[PDB]
Amino acid sequence: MLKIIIPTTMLLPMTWMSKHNMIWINATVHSLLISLISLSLLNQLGENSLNFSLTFFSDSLSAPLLVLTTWLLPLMLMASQSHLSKETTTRKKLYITMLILLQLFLIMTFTATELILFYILFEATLVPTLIIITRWGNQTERLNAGLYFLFYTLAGSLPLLVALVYIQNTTGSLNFLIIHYWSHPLSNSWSNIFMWLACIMAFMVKMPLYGLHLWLPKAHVEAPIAGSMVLAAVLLKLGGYGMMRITTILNPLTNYMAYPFLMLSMWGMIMTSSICLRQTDLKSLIAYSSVSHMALVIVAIMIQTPWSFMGATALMIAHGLTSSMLFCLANTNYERVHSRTMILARGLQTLLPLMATWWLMASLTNLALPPSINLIGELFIITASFSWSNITIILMGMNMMITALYSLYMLITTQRGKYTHHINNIKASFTRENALMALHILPLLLLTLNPKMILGPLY
Amino acid sequence: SAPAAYLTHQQKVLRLYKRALRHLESWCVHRDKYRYFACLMRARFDEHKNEKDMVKATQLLRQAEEEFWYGQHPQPYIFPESPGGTSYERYECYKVPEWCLDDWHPSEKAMYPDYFAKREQWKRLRRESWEREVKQLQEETPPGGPRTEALPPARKELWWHIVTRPRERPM
Amino acid sequence: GYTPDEKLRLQQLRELRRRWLKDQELSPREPVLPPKFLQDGAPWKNVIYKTYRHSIFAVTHVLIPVWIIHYYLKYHVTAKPYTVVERKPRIFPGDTILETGEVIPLMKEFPDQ
């Protein structure tokens, strides 16, 4: 809607003109308000996709995502606003602008409507997140990390761009609605195959694929947490959103081209999860868990059965929240002891309890047990996958094994057990910490009561 | 609590003795039979070479280790405190290090005026003490040998480490 | 065979530790702030706990849920079909209460035990 989008722009003047020591309150409060306004969008319709201006629309597929994306800003603020303090006022005030500018690009790029507009925003997101990773990440490697985050997107995105232009020349309009209606099959040959990869590879890069995911861990190792929460919880998911969009064309060719990527995914899930079982340091462990779940989304998209898209939507959102949650929840330790390496934390439960509780809830929904929307999101795509091939279950099952283990593992290794002796640094949990993660996890649990509003268009 | 020292023959054969004797109880179960075979066992250690030249003796050990290892029993009895244990660390959930209390903030700290008072007395004692352990450690030490710790001579003696361990069953 | 310096060390530390543990002991040191406190204390002024405690406790935990949930019963069962599906009773040779009927068969069996 054009109504939600203006105020999101309007916080910027408010940020710059805010009194130097009050800005956090301004940005926080109004970001919360605009979240609540975003929530009214959720209504959708049971038949026709909701429409607005000529240049926007709001499919059910977008709405829960939009609500989420609006919802994250305050969270990143609450996480950030103690991570930085000694920074100069102008620089901080400069800093939140990156975040909000970013979500502005998201609210624009979810409602689309032209796939060229959708693209140019899809790639426009790249800048602020780059700036954030590079200027406010800790340790040296972040510099290098910036590059991996960058070219892997562009090297994917650029051909997609040319492909898009091509279609609006071989057919009429590039607009999504009509192309949903005017859609006509493309088939074999050889030109059409390169069309296929051209319209898939960028989306399959931005949500990491197993053969290509290398940048993602090395982004998460580096980025300051506000960059981490977005880079994990959202951008992956948007790549998925777009790939769900463009599949309105293609067919029947997808039937013939899915196989290689279904192999990289069905194998890469078990593989990356296996690597996930033996990390040195936590902040990476979480990242590989994230890839290990995104593989499920990507096969869920490619088998193209309606159950699979339902499960696609659900898992996208659930993994969003749970991953962001694990990240902030890890940064807390990293700030309390600067260890980063998981081994040093040791008996953290002994010294403070409530965080152990959040570890419990968060990991617990990471492994996905009923009736978490994570789980129910996952079970559908196992169903449709199983319809697609009866063998496939033997792969999915192994996932559900290892995702148990390492998940519980991150719990039992960084918590249960003896305190390290000399680490006096810990200081008994701030209110904002508990507030923050309670803010992640409560929506995630209420949300199970009413799935029917999250399953998306193919409900 | 008496660290290191590169090993010697006598203590070696001794530990083999306590060990074998214990597994021997683990077999004999009854106090009776165990007593009998125990006396028989020590009788074996003396009746054999209670005195001998070393070069034979080590061979006697190499014999004994095998003869034990064959008979060592799938699982010995183990007291709960011991590393086997039915409760080797049941209470490590509880033994919170002292410095952590030093964090409660005044509304809690007011409620135990006495204990906190005595505690600052201690902490004072330490912060006052420390340079002396510095100079002494610096003094008694050569470049730095195998031995750990060094004797008191007029005050204090690296005590804060052990003296303020959080007892054994805090809860 | 302990070295004497080790002996004095262990002695010193033993003394200091017993001193510590003795220091750990508290006396009348256990304490509390004055303690709505009236919201609890006023209610206890007239309660006869020996029977009344079981009274109120049982009142809540068994009386409220059944009233509520049965009211929810008139909701969901009266509202919709197939919310509740009975096994339907076995009907032997004896007459139904629905409308008499039913009959015994043959009884040609003979001998016993």
């Binding site: - | 952590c100 | 508290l26 256990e30």
Partner: peptide, 12 residues
């Protein structure tokens, strides 16, 4: 009571 328990602050 008789002896002082240690325990992390539970106030926060």
């Amino acid at each position: 009571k008789r002896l002082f328990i240690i325990k992390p602050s539970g106030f926060y």
